[PDB]
């Protein structure tokens, strides 16, 4: 027995998942393509119409599921959609997807690109969560991607103000970011306490270490994303510019570009004053003492100067000190972080004053 509602045809035995409203997703086919067949009830026929329309407008993005067709019979409405590997919940909870060798930062960059696309088309998802974010089937080059599907919300992932602006999605994304990164934790705790904690603004990002550079940069972003004030949350395009998505090569380039921007620059100047403020503690009182034994033999403003000079004169430097420092650029920048885990976070926050400048266009959003 196999249901055929032309051009759609699904096998009733093959079930991919279930929906909270009674909807059931089957493994089926459309125009000789392997698709996912979403079966919806008559109570949700109205919902289905606006869902497939929003998709008609946005499915061209590679991070928004591809929508194929909708066929209606006397009993149900069927949505032929792109076939995927798992949900982001199934990916994070079951670490047998570990062997897929996917990068969490790449999945979150992919999720935020899809979100940015919806927001650019003047679409607010309103229900972003790991169940709704999908893992694609490996393409011909074996690459897997994160995609957005299923468009008032679902408990624990709803912005406090929602109890219909784009910033509601940034809140939800902020929780998804921590969920992926921590590997299953949520800023507002366990599943059943989340919405009460959101209303109360009671959050914890304690999986993120305060003296670990990767955890520091992730926290700078996530805290602004899950902000109780919507107006304080960055746009999707601002999130995509954050150092959380930068490569080790890019991070080092920023440290060079900022040290190039200072000198000549007077201390009373509006740029040098904002950079020096509160670090001190960023440099760990004295940066000369915490450095490795051979480098010390060879102010943030002068620490950045040291890093720029040793980078520039790297191949005309002794083999003993380039051994403890390099190889450049990856291992060289990883030397200084987490030697100073607040170095990049502080410099990025401080150098915001130059966002508009052409040299700082790949680092900020205007
Ligand atoms: Na797509």
Residue numbers in the entry: 562 to 712, 732 to 743, 751 to 885, 896 to 963
Wording from the paper:
IRE1 resides in the ER membrane. It has an N-terminal stress sensing domain in the ER lumen and a cytoplasmic kinase/ribonuclease domain which are connected by a single-pass transmembrane helix. The lumenal domains dimerise in response to ER stress bringing the cytoplasmic domains together. IRE1 then undergoes autophosphorylation, generating a specific endoribonuclease activity that hydrolyses 2 stem-loops in the pre-mRNA for a bZIP transcription factor.
Purified, dephosphorylated hIRE1 crystallized in the absence of nucleotide and diffraction data were collected to 2.6 Å. Our crystal structure shows apo-hIRE1 is a symmetrical dimer in a back-to-back conformation similar to the structure of phosphorylated yIRE1, and distinct from the face-to-face dimer previously observed in ADP-bound hIRE. While the unphosphorylated activation loop is not observed in our structure, the kinase active site has features associated with a functional kinase: the conserved Lys-Glu salt bridge between Lys599 in β3 and Glu612 in αC is formed; the side chains of Tyr628, Leu616, Phe712 and His686 form a continuous hydrophobic R-spine, although the side chain of Phe712 is mis-aligned; and the gatekeeper Ile642 packs against the αC-helix. However, in the apo-hIRE1 structure there is a large void between the RNase domains and only 227 Å2 is buried. However, in the apo-IRE1 structure there is a rotation of approximately 13° between protomers pivoting about a fulcrum at the interface in the N-lobe. The rotation keeps the N-lobes in close contact but leads to a ~ 10 Å displacement of residues within the RNase domain core. The contacts between monomers at the apo-hIRE1 dimer interface are symmetrical and mainly within the N-lobe. An extensive network of salt bridges and hydrogen bonds is formed between an acidic region at the C-terminal end of αC and β4 on one protomer and a basic protrusion formed by the β(−1)-β0 and β2-β3 loops on the opposing monomer. The activation loop is well defined from 711-726 and 732 onwards in the ligand-bound structure, whereas residues 713-731 are unresolved in the apo structure. The twist in apo-hIRE1 disengages the RNase domains, which might reflect lower RNase activity.
